[PDB]
Structure 1
Amino acid sequence: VEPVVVIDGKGHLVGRLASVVAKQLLNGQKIVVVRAEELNISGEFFRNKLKYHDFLRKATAFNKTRGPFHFRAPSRIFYKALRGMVSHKTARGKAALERLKVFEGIPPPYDKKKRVVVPQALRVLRLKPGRKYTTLGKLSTSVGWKYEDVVAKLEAKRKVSSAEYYAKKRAFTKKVASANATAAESDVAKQLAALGY
């Protein structure tokens, strides 16, 4: 439907989001996933750390450089889950994985564009209240990701600029409303209301 769909990864369960995004990419939709460090996984943090250590234990014995490459960044973890959900060894799977892009935080191309959510992947809607969960950034830094703090700093700066922009947009909308309330309740507005608009 859209050229690119940009997904706020915050609050999203990694598996549900990966399944949704893999289906979309195979269906032909370009997807950019931001805030990967704020993705959620159900279950306790210690549990998912044990799961990642089980993943880490697997490596090609005679040469560890041929073995599974245990990527540590939250974006790379999400990408690994999605590549597992895509038939990545065929040209169609490669095309879908090319359609996908995933980042930590929100880079400059996408901090100025709209970001959406997938309610069938959101933890607040899916997980039962009182269930423990972990954050991909916390797990990643526990297992060797080196940029929790750089991303947090850039995120604070970006959120500051975006909050200033939102304050300006609110002011403009409120002033538009104040100025055009005089032109409101007019005959044209009444006809539109009768028509349903």
Structure 2
Amino acid sequence: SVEPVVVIDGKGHLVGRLASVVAKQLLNGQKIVVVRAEELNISGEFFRNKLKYHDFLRKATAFNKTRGPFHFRAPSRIFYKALRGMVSHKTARGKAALERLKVFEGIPPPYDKKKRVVVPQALRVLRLKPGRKYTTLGKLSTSVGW
């Protein structure tokens, strides 16, 4: 498969905070993947999350025709896309370290060994006085067809 450099878990983990790291590191040269896209969460929700996202109610998909653009539906692409943002994807080391990063669908990570968390981008979803409903990953991409 792809050669990992530092594979990163992404379970309860804010997506951007993670992909705002691995897309820095990616830039420097580092190779690799986040897994557990699927459980990777962004806060604020169950509404202006479903919409302005990619549901078949978001209407992100099915948005247009021969003009695009199209978005993504799978939890992989959904926050792969986030990764492209925060990268000068178009050219240079941009689409370079870009290609050299993959997000994997996964329940517990498909590759054998648990991968590291990042500098605290953790859910801390327990007795969330500070927390509130934030649920995303698969779920957003589940309302939307896979």
Which residue pairs with 1:54 in the alignment?
Answer: 55
Cα offsets for 1:3-56 (capped at 9, x unmatched):
600111101111111111111101111121111000001101222001215998
Question: Residues of 1 paired with 2:84 and 2:124: CA distance?
Answer: 21
| 8 Å contact kept, 1:42–1:127 | no
* SS in structure 1 at match of 2:34: strand
Q: 1:126 to 1:70 in 2, by over 3 A?
A: farther
Q: Size of the alignment, in residue pairs?
A: 145
Question: Residues of 1 paired with 2:40 and 2:105: CA distance?
Answer: 10
Q: 1:125 to 1:57 in 2, by over 3 A?
A: closer
| 8 Å contact kept, 1:28–1:96 | yes
Cα offsets for 1:86-117 (capped at 9, x unmatched):
00011210111121011110698722464444
Q: 1:54 to 1:74 in 2, by over 3 A?
A: closer
Give the number of the structure with larger relative contact order, counting CA–CA contacts within 8 Å between residues 6 or more apart. Answer: 2
More strand by share: 1
Question: Residues of 1 paired with 2:99 and 2:32: CA distance?
Answer: 10
| 8 Å contact kept, 1:73–1:140 | yes
Cα offsets for 1:109-166 (capped at 9, x unmatched):
7224644444235554998623220121000011222xxxxxxxxxxxxxxxxxxxxx
Question: Residues of 2 paired with 1:62 and 1:124: CA distance?
Answer: 34
| 8 Å contact kept, 2:53–2:60 | no
Q: 1:52 to 1:125 in 2, by over 3 A?
A: same
| Length-normalised TM-score, structure 1 | 0.60
| 8 Å contact kept, 1:55–1:70 | no
| Length-normalised TM-score, structure 2 | 0.79
Q: Percent identity?
A: 100
| 8 Å contact kept, 2:38–2:107 | no
Q: 1:122 to 1:24 in 2, by over 3 A?
A: farther
Which residue pairs with 2:29 in the alignment?
Answer: 28
| 8 Å contact kept, 2:17–2:121 | yes
| 8 Å contact kept, 1:6–1:116 | no
Q: 1:112 to 1:54 in 2, by over 3 A?
A: closer
| 8 Å contact kept, 2:7–2:115 | yes
More helix by share: 1
Q: 1:62 to 1:32 in 2, by over 3 A?
A: closer
| 8 Å contact kept, 2:50–2:57 | no
| 8 Å contact kept, 1:49–1:143 | no
Which has more radius of gyration? 1
Unaligned runs of 5+ in 2: none
Q: 1:53 to 1:112 in 2, by over 3 A?
A: closer
Which residue pairs with 1:18 in the alignment?
Answer: 19
Question: Residues of 2 paired with 1:28 and 1:76: CA distance?
Answer: 21
